[model samples]
Target chain A: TIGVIVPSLINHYFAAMVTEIQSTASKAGLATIITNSNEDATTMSGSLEFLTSHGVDGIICVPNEECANQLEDLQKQMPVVLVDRELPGDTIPTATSNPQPGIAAAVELLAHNNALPIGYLSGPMDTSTGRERLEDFKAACANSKIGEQLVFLGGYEQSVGFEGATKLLDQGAKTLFAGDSMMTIGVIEACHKAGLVIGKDVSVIGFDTHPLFALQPHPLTVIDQNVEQLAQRAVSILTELTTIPTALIHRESIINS
Target chain B: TIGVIVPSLINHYFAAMVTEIQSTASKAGLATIITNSNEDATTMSGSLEFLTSHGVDGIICVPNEECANQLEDLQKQMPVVLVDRELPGDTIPTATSNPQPGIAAAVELLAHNNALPIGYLSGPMDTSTGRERLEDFKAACANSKIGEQLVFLGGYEQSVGFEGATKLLDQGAKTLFAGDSMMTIGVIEACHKAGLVIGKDVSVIGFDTHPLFALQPHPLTVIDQNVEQLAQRAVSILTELTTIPTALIHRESIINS
Candidate 1:
């Protein structure tokens, strides 16, 4: 059996990913041991130790920022596959979303619609996705000749998103770029509470497309994370890692390209 | 340390409850060992065994339907507190929501608003909350003199909610009562896709309040599941259980009652 660890299930991202991971693993005739770390580094470390002691054949993890370094120790014990984020050295096999392409497309679309001077509500820098996406947004703005003046580098939670939106609006942001779906909801709530119109007074784009977005009064323009591909590839690598030679595993530092 | 076993964190109910449980435990100078069972009976049982072997002082579980029988075996090992659902014969000290009050209020409000012949999209009966809430809705309907013609029983998921809503709408449902938050999202999406206006063409009263509802174009009128109180009470009982005898635990069949 393979052990799967997630940061939290508060967001649809991990919830949907786990479902896919379990389904794919079961199809491969493998059993899964799933656990949630509740986004804490200490708890995550304990979870790793527990899973390790349980004698899981391999492990797949979505490591939180604080616990990213802890993965190095676990890698020595088992074949570990990282998902949705990467460590600095790329020491382990990983299957993650390359959000640069999707983010660039969204920035261009928003700019073309005359929503320049876009403000960003970025995820916490502790995680790779948050840091990488923020850097990509800055580069995209520079390439598009859009000045990045109003930006909020807060966490990926709804409250932070709400606060960031309020701050940006105060500084005259014409459009907003939320780093994830939760933040997008925060921005929407902030705008609604302030009596500002979305998609009219200010254009907004979000990352991580959700099913509920289509039902919203103003459906958000979101960048899809492609969780299906990410989960499938992650599970595929995890199952293979159980049997593959250590020499081959070392050669392929990052799994699924 | 106390061990917390949630069926799944995909829903806000458990997410919010866990946060409360952790906070309450922390204030009592206790550490928590949290695990997600992913709503699978085998996973939940394994989690219990793992926590027990780790030498936890007490265990608090939100058990899935099939695993209530499994808990009886574990209860002999340590004090156990069940949250949000109960097993047959009220086998353990449980902290659960009595949805009758909220469901009754919702039914009355919908009827008063001319949403007669109210259709319910009930959650699957395997879980206690789903079964109890559906039973509450039937009782409420009978008391309110509203015949139950358009009722659909399905799992507490978005796809099920969408399909159930479609079926009930076809059967001439005037207003919809969603069993939980995920299903509420599904119902809203289905209605939006069909070009039907929410709060006008068909009023919606959802169970489980969430932060995103305030941000929606058409914010839903929902029945609040007081997760805060439930979590607080469960933790309070758990802390006491360590010192209390097994006889006391049995006498307190349902915790915080």
Candidate 2:
């Protein structure tokens, strides 16, 4: 029995992968199981316990942000694959998007446009994308000789963007970028509320790249995670153990290729 | 800019589809916009208006059950493709699981085990799945000869399931079947509390197999919808509208096939 685990179904990346995994498992005549982290460690632990107790043949997960202390216990049972996020970089198949190129691209795009201070919004720093993006942005600034600019987090959802953007605007950020499309929603809302015209007053970029939400006109520039490729890579790695493991930050940002 | 609309990102299936659609659109070099219904018609209408106001190139949605009334107004601006759920028979790119085959398969499986008076836990009738399943089950029963058994809707969400189950049990239903996987979670809980050993005593079946929930030692018999096929079919229909628009209902179920 193969098992695929996820932090929350609220995100599409995880959902598509599970759907793919299910189909792949069926084609292979393998029974599969799915477990959720429920976006909480305690709940995730219970879910893991249940899957382990049932003796899943393999497991996949986007390890909880609080998994540092729980890693040793989790690795004991089945072969695990990580997607969307990464673990401590050992013994698990990890495939995720690279925020560095995209973040650099976004920041550089606005920078070239003469957008000053290049205001930025991100998600919680505990996750891979958020932290990597911050590190990458600073590195990009150093490389481009355009001194690093201001950045903030949108907390978690769209509401975070609104509140976080308000704070950034007050901090004198001329141009802003939001992490993940959901946060962009809030950031855009705050910008509109404050009477800022996008592209003119502030140009924004986002991650997550949700199709429905991102369809807004002059849509915020974003990094595409290549959700399908990520899902396919995750399953390929999970199902075919002999495949040599490699980690790549997929570069699918919506700027300059 | 293209717009993709869904009831909520809070739900797993829709969330995953939205994610992929964004990636696909981005790959095709199109700007994308996204919106959520939040399961409210007012929110849905407002989301549509927002999308329209922004001049989105196209719109994709999983309409809110109550928002069916607004279809005429929405279709006026852009071509809309509805996924996961159905609108009306005439609605564009209609793609949904054939609930009848799944129910028929479940009923036959129970009959093989000599389980009778199979109790059904349904969802609200307003949604096509609930109403259609109810109607389909009746038709399937007549054809199966094992007969239509007792059935009840446990309401919309958690609250309804508890009430619906109590009413069903009160009406003397034995073995059970639920319309959706989420509702089944409630159905299983209620049945377990009532001293039903599930597979042994009541023989429950669930539809719309959600991989997020790890089935226990006694895996509940489920009519797994072909999510991959469903999603792929939806995407195909969206891009290939000139082709004879087909409603592809992939047959997938747990009953002995």
Candidate 3:
């Protein structure tokens, strides 16, 4: 039997993963168990131990920040697959979308539109995704020779974006890139509320495509990471980890113009 | 081994069911395969046949709208468990949530708050949820001894709710109860864009406590269903069928105030 642990099953990303994991396990004639830690480290660690003691065939986890150490310790007991969110580890099968290519794509899209002097507002750096995406953006600047043009806003909350974006605009940034779609929306809303016209006065971009923003009025430029393939790859790796499990899944992301 | 097939595994309700099935299947050392019909009837039928051909011990299904007949014909091949949505049969174990209690609770909240002449809007009455929830709302009005002042707006789109709320407000509905949370948000947004006071002039209640609605300003009142229990029960029934090879999952719904 296989057990999968998730952050929140209600979300589309985790929901998609649960769907594929269950479908794959069912077809293989193997039992599967799914649990959600609700993003709580203590609860996540507790659930992990419970599944470990029960002797599950395999596990898929979306680790929370505080449980990073706990999960690495649990990896000593069984095969664990990391999905969507990642822990700082080299011990398990992991599948996720690369954020750099997509971030650069978004930048190029804005640049192609004659929108330049782009600024960036990011989520907390403690998490793997935030740090990776942030570093990826910095690397993009190095690779593109546009390091001085990028403005870094360090935070995830909407209010943070409001303050950060306003400051960037005040500093005369012609465009802005946010770490995630939510922040992108926040920045756009903040700009619009402050009488700035997005895509005109200031171009805006974000990572990760969300349906809500997919067809928004301006259709914020974003990274369209293939959630389906990412999920399928993760489950497949975890399934193989049952034996000669390679500890990596194909990870790539695409930028949406 | 057991396999559970569902229509649109990526959807919120079905996702919850899949999570439950996985958790139970993993504990029994029995593997589970989940296949999504992606809302296709032929695919669901094909999935069941594939599972049966591979010799799974039992099957659980959340049938696609068009696959009921196909599934009914395949019942002789294995024991089955059905959850949330139901099929016409006395043989299968079914578990369903009673949405009536939750709907009634929301209506009561409205009545206590002095919102009157409420209107009803819902998804099309082609499936169990749409039809059942409508009937329950009717029953709620009769129980409350309130005048029959509700309007039934059919369909699941936000545009439908937007138009329906417009018509209802023109017809003197001081409050509106959306059949589901999706519709509720659309109606609220439409009203807000028109500069109408939501809670004061047009109190609105919604079904399904979807987390997305939490971000809205109105803090919509909603019915809580025991989605997790429904899924766990479905798995329990499917497991039993693998042993006794005949019993089915039962149907049940929990209405939380």
Candidate 4:
């Protein structure tokens, strides 16, 4: 049996990865004792304590900074396989996403239509994914020769996306890039509520290719986080520090000028 | 600590309920040991066995017929709270949804647009939710004076919704009522794929209110399962046989004829 801790289920990105992890663990004839920390460190630590006390074979989690502080101590308790974001050191086995290729493609696509400056929703810098993606986006914009972009340093939430987009749009930013999936939905909601058509009036790029993204009349560009690979590799790493890759999926949302 | 065995996480209905359950449990400072049965009996049973071996305080599950069969024996190991559905007997404490009121309102809304025959996507009868919902819909339709509806007895999946809608459309049914949230997505997908707009070209009423439903251009009519109540009640029922009431949230998806 294995133990699991995810960030949140409401976010389709974590939801997708966890389902795949469950399937992979199930196929391997392992029962996963899962828990949702709801992005709380104390809850995560308590969850890890519960899983440890239960005497499961191993545990998997996407560690935030607070959780990262205890990884060394937790590792002494049980085998810890870090999934999603990696810490600074090589002390733990991990299956983390590499954001360079995907972010570059996303910004390059945004650069195609220079009518409006790019609006970037960079998620919190406290976590590895947030920092890596933000830095990658910066470099990518530089390479694309896109100038004077709007940036929203925010947390991962729909409300943040909505508010950030609203502020950016008021400042004449038309092309939007959401750093996470939840923010992407907010960005869309903000755009639509402002009487803007997704493909026709605004250009947008989202993180995490989710099934929900396909329902729109205008197909949105997304960063495919290869959740399947992350799922498999997490179990296999229990069985890379393996580095998983993300890809940019271009759709009509990023129309060329 | 508590143990949880849910039907499936990918389905937004279960996803919504589970997150609430997690939050409730977290607030109480009781950690949840969760697992997704993926609607498999063996997996459900094995999960029950694992949770039992780990010696959790109690277990909560939305049991199928097979899992329900083992409730007698499993109860001896740990307290079990049945959620979402109930069996023929009150062998276990439960937090189940009553389908009549919501289903009736949904059917009556469908009946308003009598230009086209009602198309019903009745989910499978293996589980309590499937059977009760189907029976409720039947009785509701009868009360609404609707005659000879096209019914597709199918499982809960987006593909089932798409295919069932495709078949129903060909047969001249216009108001599509999906038995589950997943099928609702399929219904919308099929409707859009056929070049038919949702509220304008066809009517859609989805079961289980999900956030994804709101993103559509045409807001959908939905049967609110009162998932938050169920979540609280399940832990509270652990903390009904407390019956939770469902509701019909009327939206513009049901346009008047």
* Local lDDT at B87 for model 4: 71
Q: In model 3, where do residues sit more than 4 Å from their true spots?
A: A1-9, A13-132, A140-207, A211-257, B88-90, B156-172, B181-201, B242-257
TM-scores across all candidates? 0.84, 0.49, 0.58, 0.95
| Clash tally for model 2 | 20
lDDT over C-alpha atoms for residue B76 of model 4: 63
> What is the DockQ score of candidate 2, to 2 decimals?
0.07
Considering DockQ, which of the candidate structures 1 and 2 is the better prediction for this target? 1
Q: Roughly what TM-score does model 1 have, to 2 decimal places?
A: 0.84
**Candidate with more favorable, higher lDDT: 1 or 3:** 1
Determine the iRMS, in angstroms, of model 3. Answer: 7.7
**Model 1 alpha-carbon miss at residue B206, Å:** 0.5
The lDDT per prediction is: 0.72, 0.62, 0.63, 0.81
Displacement of the residue B34 alpha carbon in candidate 4, Å: 0.8
Among all candidates shown, the one with the greatest lDDT: 4
DockQ metric for all predictions: 0.31, 0.07, 0.18, 0.67
Cα deviation at A96, candidate 4, in Å, is: 1.0
Model 3 lDDT at residue A134: 78
Q: What is the C-alpha lDDT profile of model 4 across A137-206, one tens digit per residue?
A: 8888888887657889878677877898888888887788888987788788787778888888888888
Please give the TM-score that candidate 4 achieves against the real structure.
0.95
Error of 3 at B189 (Å): 5.6
Candidates 1 and 4 compared: the better one by TM-score is: 4
Name the lDDT value of residue B146 in candidate 1.
71
Model 1 per-residue lDDT at B90: 56
